[PDB]
């Protein structure tokens, strides 16, 4: 695998180059938010982001070396996580706000339009505030996002080790001491547990019956949801 031969700088360059674009939503400032209109916005946005995420994944070193099944499995598991870390990253310099899109900047009060959504909005906001306090760097972000993709579901474990090496390389380059490197590496990885948690609780609402009935979902998104709901308790 050519991914295992990359240098740290090459790894960073490839990941930075593979970054998806930031998309817009069709929000109307004159129209007040209902449960349906709010869900309609986020669903439409997430659905368009999914297509970009799928092609982004193919440009993650080592991913295209996997079988089609494992590629599908990893993406089915990680998709909401990857959407979420993207959200909290672009919301970093907007304290108390969530920048879903440049034209869609929401706070926790707007999240109360949707039953059970303000709780996850709170968690996302705390995560974004956590990244801001850590002064998370863009190079570190793309590493964390790739880790999420590969850790969601021996070759994979070799790539993960490489990204760990890459993270350490970035921190040592910033002038951090050895102790400060270990600690920061830990602080970043533990945040992934919180990202996993937010995804689990968020997905639980999303594949609920109230949530699948409120707005039309695309066939892609509908299949991403059912991949998780399969393990949910049957009433």
């Amino acid at each position: 695998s050519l991914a295992l031969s990359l240098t740290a700088d090459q790894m960073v360059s490839a990941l930075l180059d593979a970054e998806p674009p930031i998309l817009y939503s069709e929000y109307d400032p004159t129209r007040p938010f209902s449960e349906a209109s709010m869900m309609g916005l986020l669903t439409n946005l997430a659905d368009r982001e999914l297509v970009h995420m799928i092609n982004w994944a193919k440009r993650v070193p080592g991913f295209v070396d996997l079988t089609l099944h494992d590629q599908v499995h990893l993406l089915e598991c990680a998709w909401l996580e990857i959407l979420m870390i993207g959200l909290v990253w672009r919301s970093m310099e907007h304290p108390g706000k969530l920048l879903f899109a440049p034209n869609l900047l929401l706070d926790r009060n707007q999240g109360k339009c949707v039953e059970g959504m303000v709780e996850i909005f709170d968690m996302l906001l705390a995560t974004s505030s956590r990244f801001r306090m850590m002064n998370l760097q863009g190079e570190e972000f793309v590493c964390l996002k790739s880790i999420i993709l590969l850790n969601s579901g021996d070759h994979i474990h070799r790539v993960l080790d490489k990204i760990t090496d890459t993270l350490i390389h970035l921190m040592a380059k910033a002038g951090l001491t050895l102790q400060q490197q270990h600690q920061r590496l830990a602080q970043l990885l533990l945040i992934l547990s919180h990202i996993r948690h937010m995804s689990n609780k968020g997905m639980e609402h999303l594949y609920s019956m109230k949530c699948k009935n409120v707005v039309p979902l695309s066939d892609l998104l509908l299949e991403m949801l059912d991949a998780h709901r399969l393990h949910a308790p049957t009433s």
């Binding site: 297509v51 799928i54 193919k58 089609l68 590629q71 599908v72 993406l75 089915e76 066939d219 892609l220 299949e223 991403m224």
Partner: peptide, 9 residues
Amino acid sequence: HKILHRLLQ
């Protein structure tokens, strides 16, 4: 045959 499977090609 899943859509995600198709998009990955």
